Design a protein around this ligand. Structure first.
Ligand SMILES: Nc1ncnc2c1ncn2[C@@H]1O[C@H](COP(=O)(O)OP(=O)(O)OP(=O)(O)O)[C@@H](O)[C@H]1O
Ligand SMILES: Nc1ncnc2c1ncn2[C@@H]1O[C@H](COP(=O)(O)OP(=O)(O)OP(=O)(O)O)[C@@H](O)[C@H]1O
Ligand SMILES: O=C(C[C@H]1NCCC[C@@H]1O)Cn1cnc2ccc(-c3cccc(F)c3)cc21
Ligand SMILES: O=C(C[C@H]1NCCC[C@@H]1O)Cn1cnc2ccc(-c3cccc(F)c3)cc21
Ligand SMILES: [Mg+2]
Ligand SMILES: [Mg+2]
Ligand SMILES: [Mg+2]
Ligand SMILES: [Mg+2]
Ligand SMILES: [Zn+2]
Ligand SMILES: [Zn+2]
Lengths: 468, 480
């Protein structure tokens, strides 16, 4: 790794994702291969999130990727602005299809026709379905791995309820899991908030979000989304049930939808990565500890490495013994640091017979000598501390880089020196357009649930910044 | 359920998959919704296979679904008949794309250009990658849920090796896992074999396969596929390395690919399904035991529900997947039939009389037998009944395949045996021209299923084909 983050972030990012073996490029613009190292992080997030929404009663399923042409039109599910992003299939082989067929950019138009046929009474509610799947958005915006890709993997949850109280409660439960994914799995702090009228999903009532800060850019990014849809889609698609008390009266279902993507992995990369490459938070590292031998008799050195064995596996630590004879120790050192392995355990002959080893933390660079039989306890303590270290530096960097302005003067003074700032806000769109072009430019990120301090007149303190 | 499996198979199948809540229909022909009841089975297969290939050193990844026109134009990875099955993206919104992009029907052309860049020396091998992903094949044959769908879910594994002996061993380990998915998870027996030259993947060296039999059809089906590709694809795609100890000879990697799909769930439905609905093998049933509570007081009623919720915890604690149906708006008789249609292996009936007699009742979905159990043996005995349901389901389907797969040595007995809804092992040339002949002669058709590794009888000392001498016993039959 030779590019440096603070000077050229784009090229640093591209060289970390490649030299960590996370991403391989493809010959289609905005499409990336997720190699096992990148995919294992996604799998870990999936394991966590899946387990959580299962306690909420959500069930997994799989809906078609193709949407019929007339099911896309149906109503103002999308105002035509979102239409350029939709890829259309028009032939199989050379045979032009009777009607063109669309590639899921989201699955409302595929799912809700089915909800309307499953809901024949209030006993059929709630419906709570989730799917892990790929989606295609023909993004015009300049493409980057995991940040802005043309195909990505995600989960989209879609739930329908008899009452507003239930739907409204889920929206905030899901948003909290998203925050837990980022803050507890990925050691990235986030700001919960609600979208302004400009930035909310046109198809919903309100849109909640979690926002993250990437210092080296000075830019924020939407990490996850949870919408209350009210009855916007229920009336559109006729998901209706009989009023239990009033004969002949249909009442429309209340709906939510929520989504999280592999953009998580890029954000973790942009947040924790350093000038030596990736840095993996322990709770998602598929290798938390790598064993590397340093320095015939030698077979005793490999038996000692392989005695860390289960001694680490038996304490349920993900461990890799890199015993390959074909690479130098120094090669292994740099190879696993580029991949972001939280702890390097080096065994040298000196230490086999002094019944010691050395551990090197990927965040601090600290090298530490441990008694041979203190491996289990102290290694666990280091991996827990690395996690807390990584979340603490990212917390204290968001504290530093998120401040207040009450004037356009100091908001602008502060925006352009790499800052995101909460400002009092009209709340109206054309004002938001106006702030967008003056500072060029800043978007609205979210109206925080717990803003700075207590507050056309200002309706809300709203967090502003340049954003992906 | 209204249709009967024996009389009209399609409508019975259509009504089992829907009224069990496995499938919802879509407005695109050959595309189907996988509702939780069916998707949970896929997740169970996924969990097993994933563990197994992890021991073989295979790692999971995700490659793009889009294939460039120009990457598809470089190599010849497929014969010309497969080109129609490819769906093309030709515009975004209203803007026609400069070059069209194809939807993955399989991922050789997407992956192997990357393999070529990752492989620069012998220490870069082996490469062992797997992906769970969706695939589109614009099928001409008649589409049926989970049997033959235009979009499906699958796993495709692609591995690259330095030596031929490594590749050759993976092919059959993988195949044996497929047969394990079928025989141990779904209680379906299968026939391992090699495809004839006609039916093998044209661009590889040889194709191994497992075939399953659907009695009610008299039809067999390809349940899984494992290819040895030799070096046909390493030469096309230039996956080469130099060995320092073999100076001056270019080493092309030895490759395999293998695939298994949600056709699994369709086969399970056809094999074990009955005229009361789905029949779930305990090992993939996402609910193995359903607890149903079956006037006097409201405090008493809460105690009945507390006992059901105490059976649920005792059963989770012995790792039995359990759902307590505590919905108050349905009768017990209703819940009884609803969970039978869904194929739940065991119904647990708890009533007030059994609560104070410290008993419960279990009824098996495979035989229907009702059993009163002491409250204390719930964990031990319920576990035993699920293990016996599994063994029963696999035993009956085995005893149905032995019955329905026989040997014939004349085209004349081959025809009569075929026409009684059976699959036939016949002595066979192996040549393509002949295979077309059997196909239409038996229509006035039967195709080859596989060449069994362990055929019923040993062939030859110069035994002649059913035409040219016989090379091998070949398993022939009508097929999905
Ligand atoms: N092209 C993309 N690649 C990866 N992740 C994405 C992409 N577009 C959106 N996401 C993520 O998926 C989630 C789904 O939200 P959605 O796409 O509806 O919001 P959006 O307002 O279009 O977002 P954005 O400004 O990121 O395009 C978002 O929270 C975001 O983090
Ligand atoms: N349209 C489909 N829907 C579901 N599963 C399929 C479909 N086509 C193939 N499969 C399954 O995918 C596996 C691997 O795919 P492969 O290309 O080897 O099949 P195939 O030879 O084309 O199959 P088939 O003879 O059924 O057309 C097969 O073992 C089969 O079980
Ligand atoms: O995905 C969501 C909201 C929510 N869905 C459920 C998961 C969470 C997500 O936030 C809207 N959306 C975002 N980016 C889009 C691009 C195109 C279209 C589009 C274009 C034409 C027709 C059509 F039906 C949809 C929708 C898009
Ligand atoms: O899928 C396999 C082999 C194996 N892959 C690895 C997983 C297991 C599978 O058996 C060949 N094949 C079968 N059905 C096809 C339809 C179209 C094309 C095709 C591909 C590219 C371009 C094109 F025009 C057509 C290949 C197909
Ligand atoms: Mg977008
Ligand atoms: Mg936006
Ligand atoms: Mg085929
Ligand atoms: Mg075939
Ligand atoms: Zn204003
Ligand atoms: Zn012959």
């Amino acid at each position: 790794l030779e590019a440096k983050k603070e000077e050229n972030l784009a090229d640093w990012y591209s060289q970390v994702i490649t030299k960590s073996e996370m991403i391989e490029y493809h010959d289609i613009s905005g499409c990336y291969i997720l190699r096992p190292w990148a995919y294992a992080i996604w799998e870990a997030i999936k394991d966590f999130f899946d387990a959580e929404i299962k306690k909420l009663g959500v069930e997994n399923c799989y809906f078609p990727m193709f949407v019929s042409q007339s099911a896309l039109e149906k109503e103002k599910t999308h105002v035509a602005d979102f239409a350029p992003e939709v890829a259309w299939v028009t032939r199989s082989g050379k045979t032009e299809l009777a009607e063109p067929i669309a590639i899921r950019p989201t699955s409302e138009t595929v799912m809700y026709p089915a909800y309307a046929k499953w809901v024949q009474s209030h006993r059929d509610l709630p419906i709570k379905l989730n799917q892990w799947c790929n989606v295609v958005r023909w993004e015009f915006k300049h493409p980057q791995p995991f940040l802005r890709t043309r195909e990505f993997l995600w989960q989209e949850g879609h739930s329908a309820f008899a009452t507003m109280e239930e739907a409204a409660e889920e929206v905030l439960q899901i948003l909290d899991l998203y925050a837990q994914v980022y803050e507890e799995l990925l050691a990235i702090p986030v700001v919960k908030g609600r979208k302004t009228e400009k930035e909310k999903f046109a198809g919903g009532d309100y849109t909640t979000t979690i926002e993250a800060f990437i210092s080296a850019s000075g830019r924020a990014i939407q990490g996850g989304t949870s919408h209350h849809l009210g009855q916007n889609f229920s009336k559109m698609f006729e998901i209706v049930f009989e009023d239990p008390k009033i004969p002949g009266e249909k009442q429309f279902a209340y709906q939510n939808s929520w989504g999280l993507t592999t953009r998580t992995i890029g954000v973790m990369t942009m947040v924790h990565g350093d000038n030596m490459g990736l840095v993996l938070p322990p709770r998602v590292a598929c290798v938390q500890v790598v064993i590397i031998p340093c320095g015939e008799d030698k077979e005793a050195l490999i038996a000692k490495c392989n005695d860390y064995r289960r001694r680490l596996l038996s304490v349920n630590i993900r461990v890799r013994a890199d015993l390959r004879d074909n690479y130098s120790p120094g090669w292994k050192f740099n190879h696993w640091e580029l991949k972001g392995v939280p702890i390097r355990l080096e065994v040298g002959p000196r230490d086999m017979k002094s019944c010691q080893f050395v551990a090197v933390r990927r965040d601090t660079g600290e090298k530490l000598t441990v008694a041979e039989n203190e491996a289990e306890t102290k290694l666990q303590a280091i991996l827990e501390d690395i996690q807390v270290t990584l979340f603490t530096r990212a917390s204290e960097d968001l504290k530093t880089h998120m401040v207040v302005a009450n004037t356009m003067e100091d908001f602008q003074k502060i925006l352009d020196s790499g800052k995101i700032v909460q400002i009092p806000f009209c709340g109206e769109i054309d004002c938001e357009d106006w702030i967008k072009k003056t500072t060029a430019g800043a978007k609205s990120l979210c109206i925080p649930f717990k803003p700075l301090c207590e507050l056309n007149p200002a309706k809300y303190y709203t967090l502003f910044g340049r954003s992906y």
